Amino acid sequence: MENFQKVEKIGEGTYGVVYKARNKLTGEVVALKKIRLVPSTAIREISLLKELNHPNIVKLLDVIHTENKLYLVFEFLHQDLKKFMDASALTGIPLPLIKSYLFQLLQGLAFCHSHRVLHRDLKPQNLLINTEGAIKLADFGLARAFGVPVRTYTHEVVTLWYRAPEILLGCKYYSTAVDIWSLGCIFAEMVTRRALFPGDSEIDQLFRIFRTLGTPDEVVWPGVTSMPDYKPSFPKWARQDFSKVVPPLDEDGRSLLSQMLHYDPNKRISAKAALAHPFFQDVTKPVPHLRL
Numbered sequence: 001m002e003n004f005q006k007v008e009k010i011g012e013g014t015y016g017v018v019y020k021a022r023n024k025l026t027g028e029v030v031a032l033k034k035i036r037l038v039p040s041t042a043i044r045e046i047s048l049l050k051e052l053n054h055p056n057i058v059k060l061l062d063v064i065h066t067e068n069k070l071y072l073v074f075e076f077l078h079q080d081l082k083k084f085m086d087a088s089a090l091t092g093i094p095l096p097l098i099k100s101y102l103f104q105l106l107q108g109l110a111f112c113h114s115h116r117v118l119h120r121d122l123k124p125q126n127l128l129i130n131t132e133g134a135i136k137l138a139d140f141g142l143a144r145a146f147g148v149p150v151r152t153y154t155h156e157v158v159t160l161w162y163r164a165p166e167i168l169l170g171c172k173y174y175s176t177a178v179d180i181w182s183l184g185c186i187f188a189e190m191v192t193r194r195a196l197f198p199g200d201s202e203i204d205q206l207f208r209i210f211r212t213l214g215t216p217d218e219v220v221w222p223g224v225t226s227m228p229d230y231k232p233s234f235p236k237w238a239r240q241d242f243s244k245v246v247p248p249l250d251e252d253g254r255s256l257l258s259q260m261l262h263y264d265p266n267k268r269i270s271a272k273a274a275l276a277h278p279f280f281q282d283v284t285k286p287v288p289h290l291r292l
């Protein structure tokens, strides 16, 4: 740790405090995460992430393990998608910039998923932006290393808002499709300026999903009634049209979102396929003017 001096607090993340810090030797400015005190499988798991390098994944620079505490050192970015969404509230993010962010995050997912690494906890707070019009996913692979707790070290409630229905229904093994579901939620959120499914307990989360997308049944999702927390007594809601959910998103956009929000994870579009969707035929890379 003595190689770093703490510049400021920039978050109470899932596992510990996140600091902007400076490398007292090499001068570099980095994001420094302290991990809630570690077992050997986690060290091996984290270490494999050092190799998982992509322009849309926040680079893991180092892992520091002393007095049985754990520190991850990351590439620093100045701003997350929530702040930027708040900043953009009066007009919303321009659609060309939403499309470019979606397109880059998809490339990031397609890379990690090709290597069988999933995120499991995408949310606007771990989607970080720079002044060059780039966006990057923070904390990829950490939920498998450390688990995803109900509360953070600070007792902050972990959001359910972006959690896929299979996880909420008690599936033991979930796939890369859980990441596509969350990105789809965040897509809808950029377009509407409101969270799609802002649930405030597990059953409120499912019920909000069900209200918008129809209660899932053996027709839309073969095998669902056999899932661990599925109950035959769930209220039976009818699906709404996506024209009602995400105006004024266009037809290609609504088509893409639909396939990212399929109930059956086997049927939900992959990141790779998503990148080929007609929604991206006219994609570009705008710069946001950012206030840092």
Ligand SMILES: CS(=O)(=O)c1ccc(Nc2cc(Cl)nc3ccnn23)cc1
Residues within 6 Å of the ligand: 010, 011, 013, 018, 031, 058, 074, 075, 076, 077, 078, 079, 080, 083, 084, 125, 128, 138
């Ligand atoms: C509110 S914010 O937009 O001011 C802000 C500022 C800085 C950061 N940076 C950041 C925060 C976290 Cl948690 N992890 C990492 C990793 C690389 N940068 N970084 C995030 C959000």
